[PDB]
């Protein structure tokens, strides 16, 4: 009939235009690196639905103490090979095209998300996942965007003591 997720409490990845409405379904395992199922869904356009750890707190920081986010200025050109050039700041491997079925669970640096605390990989910005600044929804007419903060999902664990 219907199914259900595993664990709870996660950073939902939704977009005002992306249409995405998945979530960060992490299911700590016990093998190597990680074995979570962080992949959004409910999309269509070749837009993005989040980004790599590059945000300060999940919708809990305006702009003052180290903005963070991506790098480089606006720069809205993107040319496979132009005289101007472009870089932006790298793009996440999750820009629709497969139902946002992008689950990273193969070879990891140090994703000890099975230590016994969801994701004990709290380093500067644990796991940040901002769902914005990307879209490229070829619509222009309704209410697309192609760059604008609306959703987020940066849940960077916090820990500190003497």
UniProtKB/Swiss-Prot annotation:
<keyword id="KW-0862">Zinc</keyword>
<dbReference type="GO" id="GO:0019430">
    <property type="term" value="P:removal of superoxide radicals"/>
</dbReference>
<comment type="similarity">
    <text>Belongs to the Cu-Zn superoxide dismutase family.</text>
</comment>
<dbReference type="GO" id="GO:0042802">
    <property type="term" value="F:identical protein binding"/>
</dbReference>
<keyword id="KW-0449">Lipoprotein</keyword>
<feature type="binding site">
    <location>
        <position position="103"/>
    </location>
    <ligand>
        <name>Zn(2+)</name>
    </ligand>
</feature>
<feature type="disulfide bond">
    <location>
        <begin position="59"/>
        <end position="152"/>
    </location>
</feature>
<keyword id="KW-0472">Membrane</keyword>
<keyword id="KW-1003">Cell membrane</keyword>
<keyword id="KW-0186">Copper</keyword>
<feature type="binding site">
    <location>
        <position position="37"/>
    </location>
    <ligand>
        <name>Zn(2+)</name>
    </ligand>
</feature>
<dbReference type="GO" id="GO:0004784">
    <property type="term" value="F:superoxide dismutase activity"/>
</dbReference>
<feature type="binding site">
    <location>
        <position position="132"/>
    </location>
    <ligand>
        <name>Cu cation</name>
    </ligand>
</feature>
<dbReference type="GO" id="GO:0005886">
    <property type="term" value="C:plasma membrane"/>
</dbReference>
<keyword id="KW-0732">Signal</keyword>
<keyword id="KW-0479">Metal-binding</keyword>
<dbReference type="GO" id="GO:0005507">
    <property type="term" value="F:copper ion binding"/>
</dbReference>
<keyword id="KW-1015">Disulfide bond</keyword>
<comment type="subunit">
    <text>Monomer, and homodimer. Largely unstructured monomer in solution. Well-ordered homodimer in the crystal.</text>
</comment>
<keyword id="KW-0564">Palmitate</keyword>
<feature type="binding site">
    <location>
        <position position="52"/>
    </location>
    <ligand>
        <name>Cu cation</name>
    </ligand>
</feature>
<dbReference type="GO" id="GO:0008270">
    <property type="term" value="F:zinc ion binding"/>
</dbReference>
<protein>
    <recommendedName>
        <fullName>Superoxide dismutase-like protein YojM</fullName>
    </recommendedName>
</protein>
């Amino acid at each position: 009939v219907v199914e259900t997720s595993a664990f709870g409490h996660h950073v939902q990845l939704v977009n005002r235009e992306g249409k995405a409405v998945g979530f960060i379904e992490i299911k700590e395992s016990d093998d190597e690196g990680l074995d979570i199922h962080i992949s959004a869904n409910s999309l269509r356009p070749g837009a993005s639905l989040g980004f790599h750890i590059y945000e300060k707190g999940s919708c809990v920081r305006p702009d003052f103490e180290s903005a963070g986010g991506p790098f480089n200025p606006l720069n809205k050109e993107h040319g496979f090979n132009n005289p101007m050039g472009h870089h932006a700041g790298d793009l996440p491997n999750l820009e629709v095209g497969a139902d946002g079925k992008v689950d990273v669970i193969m070879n990891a640096p140090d994703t000890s998300l099975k230590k016994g605390s969801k994701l004990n990989i709290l380093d500067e910005d644990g796991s940040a996942f901002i769902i914005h600044e990307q879209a490229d929804d070829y619509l222009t007419n309704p209410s697309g965007n192609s760059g604008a903060r609306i959703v987020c999902g940066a849940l960077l664990g916090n820990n500190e003591k003497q």
